[PDB]
Design a protein around this ligand. Structure first.
Ligand SMILES: *C(=O)[C@H](C[C@@H]1CCNC1=O)NC(=O)[C@H](CC1CCCCC1)NC(=O)c1cc2ccccc2[nH]1
Ligand SMILES: *C(=O)[C@H](C[C@@H]1CCNC1=O)NC(=O)[C@H](CC1CCCCC1)NC(=O)c1cc2ccccc2[nH]1
Lengths: 302, 299
């Protein structure tokens, strides 16, 4: 009765194009008269090991970039690099360009991913940016250039572009200005993510959503101190709970009659003894990919 | 591995607002027809025992206010097909995609575009449960929201939302207005049958876990189909049929694990639980991915 909901994807679907350079095909994002895509599209197998992208780009020309929107070919009249993103200038402005901004998100915030292949949208799902700056996506070959976004009213906030796959199976990318999320680089080399942690404030938000929807068994009368909860958090690899987090949860603590430090004692108990044979909102683990705002959005229908 | 919905743009261009009396809900505008639930014409006095043929014949075209965005559509005529109402308008939707109306079977999956006042709110993936309900996320005013699949560029609409059952699950019709399951559009006490786990779907998901590189749940045993079903039914699992066995053939060939060997693994997972481990990010056995879904996401 509570579900992981993605944003409707129509405004973004109209921006997805296909970009080919040599033997590599991936996706581009077409806004006004520019197509954005990962700079590593210009790499060959023998350059992926240790690229010199400035030197690679200087060697490329406008006509080494084949851009197709549907079955209509877009002519590239210029090319430039911003950090790890390639900007391809095209002759035509996208008539479907929505109101949009480029925004860099924070670990713990959520967004929708429009997975695409060959310039064609194929699925949409909701993700969180993990504390270790990876995302636990579902991506196949040719998925590079797929974007993540939020919607606010009529404005699309683009926050993510997909670049690569870490050997642990999680995913890494940049914002739309080409800055990486996390301590990763675009070359084929030994890279590992840092130890992940659980997004504490999101777990609490989800526990409030369970209360709102009629699960109440984990609740208990005991409260706790922020100082004492954060010792338990450290042991179980949870992010520390700050006083900003407690304030953010204010609107849900009011609507349900449960103080944050009380819910923290419930969460402490679940970390120690487990769920003692139960589920919560149809899950047998503690969900951390719903933000406080997500819980309201879904419990209010914005 | 994720619960992945279809891109919703083709359906967003068809969502409108339908108002009758003091009731507002959602409509699906395709060509020069707007489809919506017929209970839009009930008053607060008409919800236990409506006679819909008597309520409709009293209505005039102008009693229905239809709004696409901020533009108001003029209703030309109206007719009822089973439990859906069909409002003819003077303008064909210019954004009408290629589409078909299909009726799905229990176990089958689809995407839902939840809408309020004709405006899309969110999209998620869903399955027709064996008791003919769905486990959706629906608030007041969501009636008229639809479920769909997309193949190539063709939208196959399969579900329109009508009501909320006391257990908190949801009931609706296909786009010809026939209810899924034994339900009716009256606010009388209505019973969702006992629900059960979609066995063929759980097996396909285990195969997906093998494809993605987890083997920890396999064992050295096999089973007869008969012995498997005798065990599974004690956990409220649906019977597995020979049809289901045939459906899993492709996935059995990819992974090299016979279907009845995978049934043995599931028999053992039901007996043992997870022992702290996880399978594709879940600590429960997931039953809302079909054999087809698994192939599309993994390949
Ligand atoms: C985008 O199209 C893909 C996304 C990959 C492919 C399918 N699943 C994913 O996670 N990105 C890549 O293929 C990159 C291309 C590189 C070019 C040079 C700069 C860095 C990116 N390659 C990889 O992501 C990759 C990961 C990996 C892990 C272990 C061994 C090899 C390997 N290659
Ligand atoms: C559509 O807008 C709603 C969807 C409901 C709202 C809350 N959660 C849902 O899934 N549908 C309704 O409100 C219907 C109204 C019609 C039903 C058929 C006959 C004419 C009116 N009502 C319900 O969904 C409803 C009422 C009710 C009363 C007591 C227990 C459960 C219950 N469900």
């Amino acid at each position: 009765g509570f579900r992981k909901m993605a944003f409707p994807s129509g405004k973004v679907e109209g921006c997805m194009v296909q970009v080919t350079c040599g033997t590599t095909t991936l996706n581009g994002l077409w806004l006004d008269d520019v197509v954005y895509c990962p700079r590593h599209v210009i790499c060959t197998s023998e350059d992926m090991l240790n690229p010199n992208y400035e030197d690679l780009l200087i060697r490329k020309s406008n006509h080494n970039f084949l851009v197709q929107a549907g079955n209509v070919q877009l002519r590239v009249i210029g090319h430039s690099m911003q950090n790890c993103v390639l900007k391809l200038r095209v002759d035509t402005a996208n008539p479907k360009t929505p109101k949009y901004k480029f925004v860099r998100i924070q670990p713990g915030q959520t967004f929708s991913v429009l997975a695409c292949y060959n310039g064609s949208p194929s699925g949409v799902y909701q993700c969180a940016m993990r504390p270790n700056f990876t995302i636990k996506g579902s991506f196949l070959n040719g998925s590079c250039g797929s974007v993540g976004f939020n919607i606010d009213y009529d404005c699309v906030s683009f926050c993510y572009m997909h670049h690569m796959v870490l050997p642990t199976g999680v995913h890494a990318g940049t914002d739309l200005e080409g800055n990486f999320y996390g301590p990763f680089v675009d070359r084929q080399t030994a890279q590992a993510a840092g130890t992940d942690t659980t997004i504490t404030v999101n777990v609490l938000a989800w526990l409030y959503a369970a209360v709102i929807n009629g699960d109440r068994w984990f609740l208990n009368r005991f409260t706790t101190t922020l100082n004492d909860f954060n010792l338990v958090a450290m042991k179980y690899n949870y992010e520390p709970l700050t006083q900003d987090h407690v304030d953010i949860l204010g609107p849900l603590s009011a609507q349900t009659g449960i103080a944050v430090l009380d819910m923290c004692a419930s969460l402490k108990e679940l970390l120690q003894n487990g769920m003692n044979g139960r589920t919560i909102l149809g899950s047998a683990l503690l969900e951390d990919e719903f933000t406080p705002f997500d819980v309201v959005r879904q419990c209010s229908g914005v």
